[PDB]
Amino acid sequence: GIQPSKKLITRDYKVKEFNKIDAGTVGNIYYTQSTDGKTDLQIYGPDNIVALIQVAVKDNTLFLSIDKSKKVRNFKKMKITITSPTLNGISFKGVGDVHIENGLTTDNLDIESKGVGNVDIQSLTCQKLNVQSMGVGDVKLEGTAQIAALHSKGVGNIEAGNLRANAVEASSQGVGDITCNATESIDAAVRGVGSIKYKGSPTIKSLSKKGVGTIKNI
């Protein structure tokens, strides 16, 4: 297919403000919560590969898409850098890893991973967290939540042992484990191949083992 050019560029897209990301691209994504009220989108890589990404903001959502019929020899060097003052949702349906390396403070965060790649969120501070992992890859979470709903359905692990939550709702239906941390309550259901491990001494627990694996307090 398309031979990536030797001219490595950064394309800056002055997009409208958004609080949600919906991406069907190839390449790693790095999200930063802005501290100066700015919204920005930068795409780094070979100029003829960067040119394949279509960008639009609609209903407070940043949509990143590609012409799926386009053959590319390789997607090496592709880096998508996203920044906005707020973030409430990530819907990922491409190939690559999604990062929040330096924190996110939000009320509600909804993570929907339906692609090939990992999700790694560090220093998260939220009220409600909802994770639906449905693709191939791991979802790594660190920080705090009042409520954390962790639902794994694809192939991979939810690594949320360092995500301190008061109430946890965990269900494992694919292939992989859920590691979590519940200080007050835990509703855990094993329904696939894999186990649910939880830190803490929750007052209320509701456990259901209906697959291949176990529920263990660690």
End-to-end CA distance of the chain: 50
**Contact status: 51 vs a copy of itself (CB under 8 A):** no
Choose the stretch contacting Cl ion; rule: CB under 5 A; options: 20-28, 121-129, 169-177, 179-187: 179-187
**Contact status: 177 vs Cl ion (CB under 5 A):** no
Q: Under a CB-based contact definition with an 8 Å cutoff, are residues 62 and 82 in contact?
A: yes
Determine whether 185 is exposed, middle or buried from the number of CB atoms within 10 Å of its CB (0-12, 13-18, 19+): middle
- Enumerate the β-bridge partners of residue 152: 133, 172
Q: Which amino acid, one-letter code, is at 45?
A: G
**Contact status: 179 vs Cl ion (CB under 5 A):** yes
Residue 124 has a CB neighbour count (10 Å cut-off) of: 21
- Enumerate the β-bridge partners of residue 100: 121
Choose the stretch contacting a copy of itself; rule: CB under 8 A; options: 8-16, 33-41, 116-124, 198-206: 116-124
Kindly tell me which residue out of 134, 141, 165, 170 binds a copy of itself, with binding defined by CB under 8 A: 134
Q: Tell me the torsion sign for CA atoms 154, 160, 163, 165.
A: positive
Choose the stretch contacting a copy of itself; rule: CB under 8 A; options: 36-44, 82-90, 103-111, 188-196: 188-196
Whole-number Å distance between alpha carbons of 202 and 57: 42
Choose the stretch contacting a copy of itself; rule: CB under 8 A; options: 9-17, 49-57, 63-71, 163-171: 63-71
What does 202 bind: Cl ion, a copy of itself, none (CB cut-off 5 to 8 Å by kind)? none
Kindly tell me which residue out of 50, 75, 149, 196 binds a copy of itself, with binding defined by CB under 8 A: 75
| Complex with a copy of itself: residue 32 or 118, whichever CB lies closer | 118
Determine whether 25 is exposed, middle or buried from the number of CB atoms within 10 Å of its CB (0-12, 13-18, 19+): buried
Kindly tell me which residue out of 177, 179, 181, 197 binds a copy of itself, with binding defined by CB under 8 A: 177
Q: Which amino acid, one-letter code, is at 70?
A: K
**Contact status: 161 vs Cl ion (CB under 5 A):** yes
Q: How far is the CB of 67 from Cl ion (least distance, A)?
A: 29
Whole-number Å distance between alpha carbons of 68 and 217: 44
Kindly tell me which residue out of 159, 181, 192, 196 binds Cl ion, with binding defined by CB under 5 A: 159
Whole-number Å distance between alpha carbons of 202 and 183: 5
Which residues of this chain interact with a copy of itself, rule CB under 8 A?
Answer: 1, 24-28, 66, 68-76, 78, 93-97, 114-118, 134-138, 153-157, 173-177, 190-195, 207-216
Which residues of this chain interact with Cl ion, rule CB under 5 A?
Answer: 159, 161, 179
